[PDB]
């Protein structure tokens, strides 16, 4: 096959590039939460 192979390396491209910016979610964002109700819990 040579044609679902297209679906292979594209996921090998896409998902890793899709894996990317969630490191900034781990990276960028003491206090975290500011609501009067949120601190009741």
């Amino acid at each position: 096959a040579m044609r679902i192979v297209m679906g292979s390396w594209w996921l090998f491209t896409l998902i890793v590039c899709s894996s990317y910016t969630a490191n900034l979610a781990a990276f960028l964002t003491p206090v975290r939460t500011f609501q009067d109700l949120s601190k009741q819990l």
């Binding site: 679902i4 679906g7 996921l11």
Partner: peptide, 29 residues
């Protein structure tokens, strides 16, 4: 992202159908 594989999927199924179309060209000839 939510639909990154979705938009490319039907493109791949279009590319999937050309192979079996040439195999029906073989089933005719």
């Amino acid at each position: 992202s939510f639909a990154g594989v979705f938009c490319i999927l039907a493109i791949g199924l279009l590319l999937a159908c050309l192979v079996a179309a040439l195999e029906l060209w073989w089933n005719s000839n």
